[PDB]
PDB file of C-alpha atoms and ligand atoms in Angstrom:
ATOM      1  CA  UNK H   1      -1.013  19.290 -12.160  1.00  0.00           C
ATOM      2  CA  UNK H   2      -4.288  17.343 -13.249  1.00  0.00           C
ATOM      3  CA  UNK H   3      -8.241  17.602 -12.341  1.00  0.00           C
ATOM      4  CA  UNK H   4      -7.139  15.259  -9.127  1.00  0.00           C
ATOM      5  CA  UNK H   5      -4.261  17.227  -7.732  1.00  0.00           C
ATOM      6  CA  UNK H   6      -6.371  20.529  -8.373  1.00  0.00           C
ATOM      7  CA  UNK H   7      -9.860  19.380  -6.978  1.00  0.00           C
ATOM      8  CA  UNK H   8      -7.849  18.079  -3.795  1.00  0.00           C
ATOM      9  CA  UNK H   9      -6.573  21.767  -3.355  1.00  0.00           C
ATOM     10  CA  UNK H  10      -9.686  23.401  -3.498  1.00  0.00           C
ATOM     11  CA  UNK H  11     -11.800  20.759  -1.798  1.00  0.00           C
ATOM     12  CA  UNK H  12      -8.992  19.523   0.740  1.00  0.00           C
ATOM     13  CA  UNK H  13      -9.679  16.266   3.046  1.00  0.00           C
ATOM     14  CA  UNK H  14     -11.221  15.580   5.960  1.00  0.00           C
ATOM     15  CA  UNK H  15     -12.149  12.142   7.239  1.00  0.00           C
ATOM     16  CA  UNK H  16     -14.657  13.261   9.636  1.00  0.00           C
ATOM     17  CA  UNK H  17     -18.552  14.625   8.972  1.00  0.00           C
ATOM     18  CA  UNK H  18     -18.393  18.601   8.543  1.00  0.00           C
ATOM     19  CA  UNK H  19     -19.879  21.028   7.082  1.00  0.00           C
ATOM     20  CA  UNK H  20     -19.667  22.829   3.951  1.00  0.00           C
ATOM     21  CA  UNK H  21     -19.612  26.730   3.419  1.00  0.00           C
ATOM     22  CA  UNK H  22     -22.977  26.550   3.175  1.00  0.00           C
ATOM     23  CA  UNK H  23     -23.778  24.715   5.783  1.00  0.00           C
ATOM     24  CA  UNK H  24     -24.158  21.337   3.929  1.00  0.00           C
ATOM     25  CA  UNK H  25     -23.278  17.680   5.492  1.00  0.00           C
ATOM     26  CA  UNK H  26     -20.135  16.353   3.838  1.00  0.00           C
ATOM     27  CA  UNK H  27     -17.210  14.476   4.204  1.00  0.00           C
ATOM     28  CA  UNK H  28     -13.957  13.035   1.980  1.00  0.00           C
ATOM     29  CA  UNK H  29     -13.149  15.720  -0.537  1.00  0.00           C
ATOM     30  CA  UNK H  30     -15.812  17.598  -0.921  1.00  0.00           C
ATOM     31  CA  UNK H  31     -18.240  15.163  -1.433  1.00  0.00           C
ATOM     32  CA  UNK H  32     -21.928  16.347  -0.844  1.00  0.00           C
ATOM     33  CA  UNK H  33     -24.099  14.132   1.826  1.00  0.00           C
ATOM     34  CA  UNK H  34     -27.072  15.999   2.207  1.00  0.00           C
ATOM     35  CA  UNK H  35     -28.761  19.141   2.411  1.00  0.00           C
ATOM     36  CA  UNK H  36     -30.651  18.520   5.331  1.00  0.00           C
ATOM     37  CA  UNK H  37     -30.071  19.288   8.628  1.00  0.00           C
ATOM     38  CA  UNK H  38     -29.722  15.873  10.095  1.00  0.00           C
ATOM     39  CA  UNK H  39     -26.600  14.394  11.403  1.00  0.00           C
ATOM     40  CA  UNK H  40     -28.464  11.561  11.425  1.00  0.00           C
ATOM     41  CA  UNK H  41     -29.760  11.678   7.899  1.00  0.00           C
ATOM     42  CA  UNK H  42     -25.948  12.261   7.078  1.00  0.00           C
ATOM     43  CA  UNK H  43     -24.971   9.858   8.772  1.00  0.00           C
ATOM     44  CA  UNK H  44     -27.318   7.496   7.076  1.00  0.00           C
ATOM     45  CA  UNK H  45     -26.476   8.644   3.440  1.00  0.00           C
ATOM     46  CA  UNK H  46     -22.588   8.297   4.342  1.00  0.00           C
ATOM     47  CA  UNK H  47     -23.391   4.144   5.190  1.00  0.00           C
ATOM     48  CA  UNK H  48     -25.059   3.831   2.444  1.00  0.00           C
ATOM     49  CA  UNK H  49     -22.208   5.061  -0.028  1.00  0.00           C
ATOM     50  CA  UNK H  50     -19.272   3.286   1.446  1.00  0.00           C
ATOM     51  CA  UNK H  51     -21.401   0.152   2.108  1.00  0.00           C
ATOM     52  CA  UNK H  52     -20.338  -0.225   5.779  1.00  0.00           C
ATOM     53  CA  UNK H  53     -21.571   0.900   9.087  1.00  0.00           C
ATOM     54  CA  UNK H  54     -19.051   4.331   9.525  1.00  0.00           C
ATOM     55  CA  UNK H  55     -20.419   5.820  12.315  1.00  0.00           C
ATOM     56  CA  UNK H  56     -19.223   9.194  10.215  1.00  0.00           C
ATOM     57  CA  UNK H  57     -15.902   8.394   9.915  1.00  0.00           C
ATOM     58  CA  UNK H  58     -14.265   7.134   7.051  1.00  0.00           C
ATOM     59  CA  UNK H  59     -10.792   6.249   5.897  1.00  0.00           C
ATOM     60  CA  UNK H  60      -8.403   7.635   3.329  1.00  0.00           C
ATOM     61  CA  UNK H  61      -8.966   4.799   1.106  1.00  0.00           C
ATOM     62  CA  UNK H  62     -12.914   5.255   1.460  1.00  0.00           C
ATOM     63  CA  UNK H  63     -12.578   9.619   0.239  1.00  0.00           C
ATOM     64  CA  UNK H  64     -10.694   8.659  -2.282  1.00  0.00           C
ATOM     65  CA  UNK H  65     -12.812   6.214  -3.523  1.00  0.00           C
ATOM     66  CA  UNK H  66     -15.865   8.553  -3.493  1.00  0.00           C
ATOM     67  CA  UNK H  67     -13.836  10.976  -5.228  1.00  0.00           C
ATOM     68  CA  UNK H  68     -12.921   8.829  -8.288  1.00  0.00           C
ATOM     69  CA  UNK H  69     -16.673   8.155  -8.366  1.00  0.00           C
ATOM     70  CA  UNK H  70     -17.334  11.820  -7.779  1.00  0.00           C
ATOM     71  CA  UNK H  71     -14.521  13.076 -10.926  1.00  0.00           C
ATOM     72  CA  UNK H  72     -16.156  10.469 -12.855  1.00  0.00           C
ATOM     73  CA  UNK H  73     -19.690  11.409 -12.521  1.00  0.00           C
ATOM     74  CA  UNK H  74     -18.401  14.807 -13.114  1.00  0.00           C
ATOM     75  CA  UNK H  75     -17.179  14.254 -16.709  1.00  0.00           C
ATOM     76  CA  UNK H  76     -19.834  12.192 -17.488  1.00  0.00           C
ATOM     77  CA  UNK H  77     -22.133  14.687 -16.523  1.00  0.00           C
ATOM     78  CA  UNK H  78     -20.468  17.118 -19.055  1.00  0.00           C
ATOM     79  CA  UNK H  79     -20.362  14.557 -21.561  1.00  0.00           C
ATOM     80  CA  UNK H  80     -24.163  14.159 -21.423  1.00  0.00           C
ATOM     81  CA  UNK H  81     -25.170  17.935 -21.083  1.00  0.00           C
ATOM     82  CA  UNK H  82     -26.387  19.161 -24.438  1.00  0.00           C
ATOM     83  CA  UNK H  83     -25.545  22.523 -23.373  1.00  0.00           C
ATOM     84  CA  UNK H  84     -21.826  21.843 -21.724  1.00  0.00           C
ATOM     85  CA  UNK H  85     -20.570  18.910 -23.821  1.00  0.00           C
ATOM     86  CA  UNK H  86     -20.142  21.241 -26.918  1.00  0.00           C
ATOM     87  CA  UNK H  87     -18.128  23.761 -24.921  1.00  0.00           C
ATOM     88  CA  UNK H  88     -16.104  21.188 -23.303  1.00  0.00           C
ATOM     89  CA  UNK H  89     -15.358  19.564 -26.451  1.00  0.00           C
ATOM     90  CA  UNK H  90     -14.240  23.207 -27.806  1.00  0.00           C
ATOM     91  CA  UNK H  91     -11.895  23.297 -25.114  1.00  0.00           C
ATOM     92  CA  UNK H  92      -7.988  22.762 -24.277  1.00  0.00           C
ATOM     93  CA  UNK H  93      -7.012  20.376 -21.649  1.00  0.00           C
ATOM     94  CA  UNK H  94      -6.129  22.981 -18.787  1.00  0.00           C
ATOM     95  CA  UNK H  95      -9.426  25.053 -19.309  1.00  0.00           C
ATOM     96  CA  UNK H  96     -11.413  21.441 -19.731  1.00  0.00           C
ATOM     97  CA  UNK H  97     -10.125  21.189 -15.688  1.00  0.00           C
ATOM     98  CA  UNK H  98     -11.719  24.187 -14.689  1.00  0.00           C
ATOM     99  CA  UNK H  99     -15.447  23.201 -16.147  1.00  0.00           C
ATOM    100  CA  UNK H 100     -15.048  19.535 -14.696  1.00  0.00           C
ATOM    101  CA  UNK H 101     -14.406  21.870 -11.336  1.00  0.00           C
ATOM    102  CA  UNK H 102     -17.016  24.268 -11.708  1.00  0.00           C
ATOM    103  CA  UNK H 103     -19.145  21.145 -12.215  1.00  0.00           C
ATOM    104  CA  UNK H 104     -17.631  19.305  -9.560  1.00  0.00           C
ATOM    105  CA  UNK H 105     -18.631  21.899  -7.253  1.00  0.00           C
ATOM    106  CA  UNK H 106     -21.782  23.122  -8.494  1.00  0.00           C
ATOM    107  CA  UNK H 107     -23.785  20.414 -10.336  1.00  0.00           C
ATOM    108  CA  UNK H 108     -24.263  20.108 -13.985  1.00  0.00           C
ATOM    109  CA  UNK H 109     -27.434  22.022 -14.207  1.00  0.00           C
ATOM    110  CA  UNK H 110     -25.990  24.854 -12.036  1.00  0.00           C
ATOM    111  CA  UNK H 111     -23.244  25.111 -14.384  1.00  0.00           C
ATOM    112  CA  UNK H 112     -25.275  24.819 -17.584  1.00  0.00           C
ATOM    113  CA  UNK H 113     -26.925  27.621 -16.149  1.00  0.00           C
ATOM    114  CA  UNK H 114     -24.001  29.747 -16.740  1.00  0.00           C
ATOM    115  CA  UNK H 115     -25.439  30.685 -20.380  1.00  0.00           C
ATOM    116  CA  UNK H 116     -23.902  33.838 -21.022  1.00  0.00           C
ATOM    117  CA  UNK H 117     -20.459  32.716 -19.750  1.00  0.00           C
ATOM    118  CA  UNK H 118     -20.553  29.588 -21.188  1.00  0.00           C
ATOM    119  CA  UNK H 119     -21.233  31.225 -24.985  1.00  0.00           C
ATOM    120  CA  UNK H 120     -18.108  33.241 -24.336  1.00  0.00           C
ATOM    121  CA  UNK H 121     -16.052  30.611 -23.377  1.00  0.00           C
ATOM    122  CA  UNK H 122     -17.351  29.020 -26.554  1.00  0.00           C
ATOM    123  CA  UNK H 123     -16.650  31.984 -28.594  1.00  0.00           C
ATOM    124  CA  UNK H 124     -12.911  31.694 -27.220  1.00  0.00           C
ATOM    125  CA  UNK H 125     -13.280  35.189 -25.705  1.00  0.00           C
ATOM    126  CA  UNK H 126     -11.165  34.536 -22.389  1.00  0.00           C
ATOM    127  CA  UNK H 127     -11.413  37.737 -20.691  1.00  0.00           C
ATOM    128  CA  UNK H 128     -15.004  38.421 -21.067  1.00  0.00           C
ATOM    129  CA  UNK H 129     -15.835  35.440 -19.980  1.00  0.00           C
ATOM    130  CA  UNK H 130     -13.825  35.778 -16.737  1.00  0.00           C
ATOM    131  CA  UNK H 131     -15.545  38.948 -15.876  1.00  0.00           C
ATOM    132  CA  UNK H 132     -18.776  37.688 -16.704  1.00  0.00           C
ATOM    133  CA  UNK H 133     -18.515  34.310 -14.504  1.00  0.00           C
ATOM    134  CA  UNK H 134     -17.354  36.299 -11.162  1.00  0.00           C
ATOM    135  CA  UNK H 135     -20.766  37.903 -11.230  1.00  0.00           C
ATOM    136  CA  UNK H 136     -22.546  35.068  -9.415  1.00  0.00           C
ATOM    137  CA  UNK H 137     -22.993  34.018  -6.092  1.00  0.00           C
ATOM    138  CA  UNK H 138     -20.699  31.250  -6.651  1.00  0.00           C
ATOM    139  CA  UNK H 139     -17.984  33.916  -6.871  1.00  0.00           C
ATOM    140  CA  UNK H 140     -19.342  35.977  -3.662  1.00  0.00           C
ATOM    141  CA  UNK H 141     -19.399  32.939  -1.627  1.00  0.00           C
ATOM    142  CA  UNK H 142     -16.188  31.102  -2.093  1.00  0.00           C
ATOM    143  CA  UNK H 143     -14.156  33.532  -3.673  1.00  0.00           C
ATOM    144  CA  UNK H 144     -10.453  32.858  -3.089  1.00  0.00           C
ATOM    145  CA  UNK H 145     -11.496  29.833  -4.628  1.00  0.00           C
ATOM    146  CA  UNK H 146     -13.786  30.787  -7.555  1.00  0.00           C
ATOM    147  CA  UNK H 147     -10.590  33.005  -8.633  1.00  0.00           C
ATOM    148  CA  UNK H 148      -8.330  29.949  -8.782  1.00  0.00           C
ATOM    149  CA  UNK H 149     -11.065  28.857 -10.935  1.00  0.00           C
ATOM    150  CA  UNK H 150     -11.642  31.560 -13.743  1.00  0.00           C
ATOM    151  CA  UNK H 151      -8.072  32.392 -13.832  1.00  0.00           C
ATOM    152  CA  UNK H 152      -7.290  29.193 -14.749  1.00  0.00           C
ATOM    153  CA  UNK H 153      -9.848  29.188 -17.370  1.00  0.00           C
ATOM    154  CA  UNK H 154      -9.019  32.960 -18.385  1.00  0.00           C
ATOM    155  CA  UNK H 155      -4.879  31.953 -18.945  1.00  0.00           C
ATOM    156  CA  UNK H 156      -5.188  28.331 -19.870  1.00  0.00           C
ATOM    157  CA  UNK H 157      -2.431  27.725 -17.394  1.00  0.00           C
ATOM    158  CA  UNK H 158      -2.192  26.181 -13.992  1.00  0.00           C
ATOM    159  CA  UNK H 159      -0.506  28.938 -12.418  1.00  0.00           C
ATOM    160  CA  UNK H 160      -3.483  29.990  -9.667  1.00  0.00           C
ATOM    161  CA  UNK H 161      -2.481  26.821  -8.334  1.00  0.00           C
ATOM    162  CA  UNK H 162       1.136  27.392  -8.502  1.00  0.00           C
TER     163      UNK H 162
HETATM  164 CL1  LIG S 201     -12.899  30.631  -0.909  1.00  0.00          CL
END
């Protein structure tokens, strides 16, 4: 199991324009379009980032390709964060996964947000922090999920994803 394998799990793939649980334009795996209500506008971001004219459909090749640049971004955004990179950096390589998802999913700032939780995961104090992360919205909204998520960083292991 790797970042890749796990993101595609919790993000799945769909080469067609939807919407996201909250209500969001997207398309590929799980990659954001806009937040605005426009098909159009959607439509318009989603030419733009593969370069062609899609007419809101894209090709296997094409959401995989955004989500290289997507898993990429992610990390980097870590790696740049003065208030993630030091807990990443504290981290093992399972639990690493489960930040670069959190971030993947929520944006760097939303994550770095996190204080509290992200102290304890710092301080190495696993079940605290798992408690302490599942109070959020993120938790309430997409919870099956969310619990892949901190058990994964509460055990170290990939077992949530079997
Ligand atoms: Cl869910």
């Amino acid at each position: 199991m790797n970042i890749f394998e796990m993101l595609r799990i919790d993000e799945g793939l769909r080469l067609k324009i939807y919407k996201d649980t909250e209500g969001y334009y997207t398309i590929g795996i799980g990659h954001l379009l806009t937040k605005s209500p426009s098909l159009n506008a959607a439509k318009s971001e989603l030419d733009k980032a593969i370069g062609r004219n899609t007419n809101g459909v894209i090709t296997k090749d094409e959401a995989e390709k955004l989500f290289n640049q997507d898993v990429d971004a992610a990390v980097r955004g870590i790696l740049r964060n003065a208030k993630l990179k030091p807990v990443y950096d504290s981290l093992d390589a399972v639990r690493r996964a489960a930040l670069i998802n959190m971030v993947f999913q929520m944006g760097e700032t939303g994550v770095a947000g996190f204080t509290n939780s992200l102290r304890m995961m710092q301080q190495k104090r696993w079940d605290e922090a798992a408690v302490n992360v599942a109070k959020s919205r993120w938790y309430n909204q997409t919870p099956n999920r969310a619990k892949r998520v901190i058990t994964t960083l509460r055990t170290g292991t990939w077992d949530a994803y079997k």
